[PDB]
Amino acid sequence: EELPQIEIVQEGDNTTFAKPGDTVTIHYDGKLTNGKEFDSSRKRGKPFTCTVGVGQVIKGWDISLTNNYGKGGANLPKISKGTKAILTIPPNLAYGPRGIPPIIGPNETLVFEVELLGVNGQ
């Protein structure tokens, strides 16, 4: 299957990993491949909290934060608490062929800078 690109820029505690159903808290920056930013929790003023692995965020996010639903994968490093990463997510794992104009265009790849701040409120 097709997976997102995950590059660790800062290692976490290598102990606290999130799994489907868990609640996570992260800070993130979202930009198009042309460098143009489309979303950012840091600029909004608060970290984002959500349930991962159940499709309540884009599929690329669920995969990165739960290590492919616990299945893992080829070249798919784990993200623990305190980990900074860069997520590259293809259209099929983002907003697909139609996209969400005028917020995001069709057939669009997305690049995220994410920092895992907490798992299950801790």
Residue numbers in the entry: 3 to 124
What does the published report state?
The 12-kDa FK506-binding protein (FKBP12) is a ubiquitously expressed peptidyl-prolyl isomerase with considerable homology between fungal pathogens and is thus a prime candidate for future targeting efforts to generate a panfungal strategy. PPIase proteins all catalyze the cis/trans isomerization of peptide bonds N terminal to proline residues in polypeptide chains. In addition to its role as a PPIase, FKBP12 is a member of the immunophilin family and is the target of the immunosuppressive drugs FK506 and rapamycin. Three extended loops, which have been called the 40s loop (between β2 and β3), the 50s loop (between β3′ and α1), and the 80s loop (between β4 and β5), surround a deep active-site pocket that binds both FK506 and rapamycin.
Three different crystal forms of the apo C. albicans FKBP12, to resolutions of 1.99, 2.3, and 2.4 Å, were obtained. While the C. albicans apo FKBP12 structure is very similar to previously determined FKBP12 structures, an unexpected finding that emerged from analysis of the crystal packing was that despite being obtained under very different crystallization conditions with distinct crystal lattices, all three C. albicans apo FKBP12 structures displayed the same intermolecular interactions between subunits. What is notable about this interaction is that the 80s loop of one subunit docks into the active site of the adjacent subunit and vice versa, suggesting that the loop may act as a substrate. Indeed, Pro104, which is located at the tip of the loop, is inserted most deeply into the pocket and is surrounded by residues that have been implicated, via mutagenesis, to be involved in FKBP PPIase activity. Three residues, in particular, were implicated as important for FKBP12 catalysis and correspond to Val59, Asp41, and Tyr97 in the C. albicans protein. These residues all make direct contacts with Pro104, which rests within an aromatic cleft formed by Tyr30, Phe50, and Trp63. Although most of the contacts that hold the loop in position in the active site are with the central Pro104, additional hydrophobic contacts with Ile102, Pro103, and Ile105 are provided, while Arg100 makes hydrogen bonds with the carbonyl oxygens at the edge of the pocket. Notably, the interface in the C. albicans FKBP12-FKBP12 interaction is minimal (burying 592 Å2 from solvent), which suggests that, like known substrate-enzyme complexes, the proteins form a weak interaction; typical dimer interfaces bury >2,000 Å2 of surface from solvent. Comparison of the C. albicans FKBP12 apo structure with FKBP12-FK506 structures reveals that the 80s loop binds in the same pocket as FK506. Interestingly, unlike the C. albicans apo FKBP12 structures, which were all captured with Pro104 in the cis conformation, in the A. fumigatus structure, Pro90 in one subunit was bound in the cis conformation and Pro90 in the other was bound in the trans state, thus potentially providing a snapshot of self-catalysis.
